[PDB]
Amino acid sequence: QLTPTLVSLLEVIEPEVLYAGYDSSVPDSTWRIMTTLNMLGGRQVIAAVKWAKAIPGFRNLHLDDQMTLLQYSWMSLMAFALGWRSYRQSSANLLCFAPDLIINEQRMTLPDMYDQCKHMLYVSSELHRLQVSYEEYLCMKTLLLLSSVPKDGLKSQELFDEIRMTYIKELGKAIVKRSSQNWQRFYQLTKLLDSMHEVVENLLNYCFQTFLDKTMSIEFPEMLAEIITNQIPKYSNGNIKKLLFHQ
């Protein structure tokens, strides 16, 4: 394949699912779960960073750049992967957060549960609608890391773009495998990385209240603290840029 593929790469650099560490037995509790996802979130995040530095060209960007990129698209990446996991078999749409923390028919019936899962289901249901191959998923996964930037680019913009494209190219080769009007297939996928922007949005709107109100009783690991705290009134000043494909 003209030696190691940048694709067959991310595939091995792709992280390994974590366990919620949920108790189950004690009847389910809405926040008992949410608060259980969050703890888990921070780990995936952390695991994501390691996954990022592990990408070609990433370590190369100016650190402050690398530092904000993740800062933005952590949500976006957290949700895209999960969609995959649910899509992986959960025909009942079941939200699969961990190999031990899945959200079934009736777990979904819980208080203000479906009220937010509906968004996450969007993905998997969408991914399932486009039968995305693990290859394409990997490549898009990476491209979501670049879904949004400042408003004034980065100390390594030139680089950043340089890289980005190469993946937009790696994704092409990805779609290729399996021809004809491949160009439409490309379109559909491409319009879904843009969809994520709204997705990643509603999630923040729900995540910030819950992160704020202690009349909720939900807890976040420190990881997401620095990360949330920061990004909050921050991006809420239109100081960021949600990168698109189609306007």
Partner: peptide, 9 residues
């Protein structure tokens, strides 16, 4: 913060 130590460690 730690995000940076993790990033640059």
């Amino acid at each position: 913060a730690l995000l940076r130590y993790l990033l640059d460690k």
